């Protein structure tokens, strides 16, 4: 709410050192925590780690891979054929391919409604500090 | 429509002027008779060999080899276009 409460300190010479500033580490920790907190409550895409039959998208005569795969659906006992386009950086060979990180980690889908636009955040010292 | 490469423009004259300023400020630290050269990133993962954007909800990895390159000797409607690869 209030305006920035900036108080000039006349005749004060302070020794600064950015490379040992703990504010940097605190910002890094806070930002990673917000990232995890925002990513946590949405899709987990564990079923997506399947064998993908992928071909080139081509120019119709002769970057992107047109991939197809058998995915799960609402019902446990039903499966559906899904056609999609992936980038070549997301897809690695086992023609048959898989996603890049399916042998390493579970990829969590970014929640559709959350935007990654940065917003200004101010860090304020607690009472007794400045 | 047609399949086209994601790409990024930086003004050539402005970038050359910026590199001139940076070279002057570096020559202040290394000496006034030295040669200051720029080159693309020498290795690593895609996050470090390219410039990473997260804009519009989409992630770009742009080849910054066009911004760097060239050597500075001690002595415009022209844009540098950087190919950008997108990763989901």
């Amino acid at each position: 709410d209030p305006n920035p409460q900036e108080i000039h300190l006349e005749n004060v010479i302070e020794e600064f050192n950015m490379w040992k500033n703990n504010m940097v580490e605190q910002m890094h920790e806070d930002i990673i925590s917000l990232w995890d907190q925002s990513l946590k409550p949405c899709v987990k895409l564990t079923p997506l780690c399947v064998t993908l039959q992928c071909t080139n998208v081509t120019n119709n005569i002769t970057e992107l891979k047109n991939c197809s795969f058998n995915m799960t659906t609402e019902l446990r006992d039903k499966k559906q054929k899904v056609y999609s386009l992936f980038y070549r950086l997301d897809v690695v060979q086992i023609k048959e391919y898989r996603l890049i990180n399916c042998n390493t980690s579970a990829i969590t889908q970014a929640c559709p409604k959350v935007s990654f636009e940065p917003i200004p955040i101010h860090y304020c010292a607690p009472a007794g500090f400045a | 429509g047609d399949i086209r490469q994601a790409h990024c423009n930086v003004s050539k004259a402005t970038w050359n002027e910026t590199l001139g300023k940076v070279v002057k400020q570096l020559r202040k630290h290394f000496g006034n008779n030295t040669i200051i050269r720029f080159a693309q990133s020498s290795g690593g993962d895609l996050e470090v060999t390219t410039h990473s954007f997260n804009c519009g909800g989409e992630f770009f990895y742009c080849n910054t080899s066009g911004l760097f390159n060239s050597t500075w000797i001690s002595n415009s409607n022209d844009s540098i276009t950087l190919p950008c690869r997108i990763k989901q």
Partner: antibody
Amino acid sequence: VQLRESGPGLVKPSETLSLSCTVSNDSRPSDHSWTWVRQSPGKALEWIGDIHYNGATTYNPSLRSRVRIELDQSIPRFSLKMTSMTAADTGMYYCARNAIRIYGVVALGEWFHYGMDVWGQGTAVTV
Amino acid sequence: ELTQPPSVSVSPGQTARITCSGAPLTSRFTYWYRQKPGQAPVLIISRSSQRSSGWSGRFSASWSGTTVTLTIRGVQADDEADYYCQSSDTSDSYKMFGGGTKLTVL
């Protein structure tokens, strides 16, 4: 667009034979690859070469050593010089435009050829 | 470098399939020209977009492997002519022209 082609017509063996082609009524000639083609009588078309306004030029291998193209850009005048011509190297010669479509950023190589859509009527040359 | 039949013969109601094959055709587009004796070639089939779409109702073509077939329906006596396939190499350094297939009308 009109491609008016001309030359000496009759030349002897072993000197340089020169051809000229005037481009008329083309808006923005710099976006097309200007090409030369030849055809001996009774034989198939033989591609000679082409040139672009940016300075890039290309030739047919095993003939490129005897051939060179110029293109005056102030007045769009499209010239060919072919040295060491032999008696058997005769027939019709045609100047033509390989129109180029751009669909993205030309600096990234995002274009393609529309083929040799406009051709000049050419000249029959005997050596 | 670019092989096509020397000639083909077709009746007025028949569709001619003029084939053209070569290694560089496995990756590059093919441009089809028609030539009459004396007259210069005229462009018949070209590339109007990165991702191909429909073309004129006549003079179509189909690609398969290293061979492209020019399908020409509704052939009449005026279409007797030498058909040429043209294509860039795999490095886009030079152009290849075919030997020409003389389409005749029975």
